[PDB]
From Swiss-Prot, chains A, B:
Name the record gives this protein: Mycocyclosin synthase
Binding-site residues for substrate, renumbered to this chain: T75, N83, M84, S235, K299, Q383
Reactions catalysed: cyclo(L-tyrosyl-L-tyrosyl) + 2 reduced [2Fe-2S]-[ferredoxin] + O2 + 2 H(+) = mycoclysin + 2 oxidized [2Fe-2S]-[ferredoxin] + 2 H2O
GO cellular component terms, semicolon-separated: cytoplasm
Record's keyword annotation contains Heme: yes
Its biological purpose: Catalyzes C-C bond formation between the carbons ortho to the phenolic hydroxyl of cyclo(L-tyr-L-tyr) (cYY) producing mycocyclosin. Can also use cyclo(L-Tyr-L-Phe) (cYF), cyclo(L-Tyr-L-Trp) (cYW) and cyclo(L-Tyr-L-3,4-dihydroxyphenylalanine) (cY-DOPA) as substrate.
Regulation: Inhibited by clotrimazole, econazole, ketoconazole, and miconazole.
Marked site: Participates in a stacking interactions with the tyrosyl of cYY: F166, W180
Cofactors demanded by this protein: heme
Effect the entry attributes to changing S277A: Has little effect
Gene3D superfamilies: Cytochrome P450
Length: 394, 394
């Protein structure tokens, strides 16, 4: 007698478990138990992952319903799970999306200067350096302060909520509520701060006093600040970190990108595709009875869309484990999801990674791990897979 | 077909695995495979642990022999494994041991002021607080700078070597050598620094120019600084952290110690006894064929002395999982080892814990975890078990 298969399989973000391919072949939708004890359907083929993400009857919003089977505990108010819907309903969709493009004047140069300044300080200090805590995450944090229009010096305390805010927990987390409420108060103060005129918060500040948005709540405006900061910083910092591992472990690739940096966009797209940053399947709740492969998913059941399931599917991406800069379908991966909830920061994230890698390869062309790869400490019960420290030398 | 049982069993430092008791009953010496692929004998009963630690033919020094079966890779020069022997041979044993007592004038008050100042800053900043990174470890770090006679401001960079120096790795760690050599150069500079006149380094500085120690190497003096700083900081910071978890999880105990703080020494002794801080058995290499329980250990074989094996042995400590402040045999645990290599900092460590707990209970009598216990991220492939962050509220 064995128990029902448990998810997630491994918190290690540097390699995919052999088990994923075996499951995809045998049972590309199959029943699993989450950390809460809930049952769920784990979907692991490209075809079935795409089907679920593209069918809105597999609802994100309804995952927050009281009494639903849960992947993990809410770390935000239940109405905040439908944040993008709330944004759209408030007529704020176009403005939010415009404010988080990497195309804003000066932004890319700010990114490059910031990356270069972080790297110079590591160089000055001498190897070993921690590329997560002292490069990737600070770069992510600086980027999102600039994108939000908020002071850089406020970034670190906001950042420090995230090790808790993005926990994947069986039970509610008291600290998450403390940090949430505090971070909300900060963003509400920002909207009242006349010095804040640029970026997302500057724009929301103005829209908040525009008559065309008079009956949009202050709660929604502050929520947008907290959610976009947290999602952006955690996602870009975590992605860049694990992409750096994948690069460092492929010196031939590292050298080619150092040699031909115009291939970096193609490289970052592949690093996105193979990225194991998302620790859990994307949760959705069936709002109807829906056939998914050989399984009739019943209304009220939880479905988990395993991103690496899709992204390493050899039917869609032949030789899935190899980075190939000339695939015919390079952006057709699901690293930024798909459908209604496709990542609004995908371009900004792509650019954070491109610029951080560009700068790292220039300043540290000899970059290598300073510890054997198995020594990396992978964060557990978290919504991302990340090494606690990423020690490198150069 | 199963593989040979692997060690360590779990990096979780908040509970002992049920498997340890089962093993102790069934097979209190049994064969296991280490992370290097080496075979070893894992010893898990009080009686057999004590036998091994008290028989010097189970050698610490010989664990460093080229070609021996290894628990993990050396992170120091092989001659440094015999550091205490080297100390004794150089006539430095009495001086080193005297310099690391908690009885030095002002030391306890420095500890208390430092603990109180760390706590006030957490209070000012507001919950949640990380009791590992922003209390236990800084307290350990400050204590050891003061004990060594070195500037407090030098503590943080020395501290940052330790996440690597105390790795438990299958392979040599390049960063460990970088940090070792750098930290050695620092301690050599300290011995040449005329401002350094107090503590262990002040005393070694003087003995280095005393004719009675003329043919003791500069290498040994600097090595003593690096080894005593690292072992002391890692051991006291890690112990206090996990003792804090054990306390916090027992509010009745926490309240009693807050109420009757004179029971704190008895409490710290029990917290020592149940402490899971050591991630691996203590390694020893047989220098002869020696009968240990039902096993004839052969010369050249590795033996691992599982401290919690001894310390949770119900034959020696009845109701082993319960903290009892009135045991008849309270200091007979093996938390500081036993025999030739008994911890030279045991009193200093006891006092760090007592004072840190005293101060925490006074400043934060309402101290509780701010996250569910399962959310703590336990450091892997490391010589200690420690949570990466210890989020608390009060
Ligand atoms: C490489 C970097 C990034 C990756 C891999 C990533 C990944 C993802 C994925 C997979 C989703 C889909 C969630 C779902 O469908 O259940 C998503 C949505 C989202 N992302 Fe990203 N993201 C990245 C960067 C960013 C940035 C920079 C921001 C903000 C500045 C951001 C903000 C959001 C938000 C607010 C959502 C929710 C969308 C919705 O519910 O409609 N992301 N992201
Ligand atoms: C609660 C705190 C502490 C614990 C639990 C602890 C634990 C231990 C243990 C189990 C050993 C035996 C190693 C073996 O036999 O293989 C040991 C030895 C040692 N400890 Fe500690 N220790 C603590 C505090 C300290 C401090 C504060 C220092 C230095 C300032 C220190 C320095 C050393 C050294 C240098 C050895 C090697 C002894 C030898 O090889 O003869 N320890 N410790």
């Amino acid at each position: 007698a064995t128990v029902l298969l448990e998810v997630p399989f491994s918190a290690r973000g540097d390699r995919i478990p052999d088990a994923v391919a075996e499951l995809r072949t045998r049972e590309p939708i199959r029943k699993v138990r989450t950390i809460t004890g809930a049952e769920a359907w784990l979907v692991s083929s490209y075809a079935l992952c795409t089907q679920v993400l593209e069918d809105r009857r597999f609802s994100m919003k309804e995952t927050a319903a009281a009494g639903a089977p849960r992947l993990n505990a809410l770390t935000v108010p239940p109405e905040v799970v439908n944040n993008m819907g709330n944004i759209a309903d408030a007529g704020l969709r176009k403005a939010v999306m415009k404010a988080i493009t990497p195309k804003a004047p000066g932004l890319e140069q700010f990114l490059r200067d910031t990356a270069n300044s972080l790297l110079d300080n590591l160089i000055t200090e001498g190897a070993p350096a921690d590329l997560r805590n002292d490069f990737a995450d600070p770069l992510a944090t600086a980027l999102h302060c600039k994108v939000l229009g908020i002071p850089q010096e406020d970034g670190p305390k906001l950042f420090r909520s995230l090790s808790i805010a993005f926990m994947s927990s069986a039970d509610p987390i008291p600290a998450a509520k403390i940090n949430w409420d505090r971070d909300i108060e900060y963003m509400a103060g920002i909207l009242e701060n006349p010095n804040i005129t640029t970026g997302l918060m500057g724009e929301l500040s103005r829209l908040r006093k525009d008559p065309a948005y008079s009956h949009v709540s202050d709660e929604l405006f502050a929520t947008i600040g907290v959610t976009f900061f947290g999602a952006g910083v955690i996602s870009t910092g975590s992605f860049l970190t694990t992409a750096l591992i994948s690069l460092i472990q492929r010196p031939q690739l590292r050298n080619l990108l150092h040699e031909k940096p115009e291939l970096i966009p193609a490289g970052v797209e592949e690093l996105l595709r193979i990225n194991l940053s998302f620790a859990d399947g994307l949760p959705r709740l069936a709002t109807a009875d829906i056939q998914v492969g050989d399984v009739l998913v019943r209304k009220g059941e939880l479905v988990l869309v395993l991103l690496e399931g899709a992204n390493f599917d050899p039917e869609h991406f032949p030789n899935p484990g190899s980075i190939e800069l000339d695939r015919p379908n390079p952006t057709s991966h699901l690293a930024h999801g798909r459908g209604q909830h496709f990542c609004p920061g995908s371009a900004l994230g792509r650019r954070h990674a491109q610029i951080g890698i560009e700068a790292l390869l220039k300043k540290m062309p000899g970059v290598d791990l300073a510890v054997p790869i198995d020594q990396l400490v992978w964060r557990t019960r978290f919504q991302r897979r990340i090494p606690e420290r990423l020690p490198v030398l150069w």
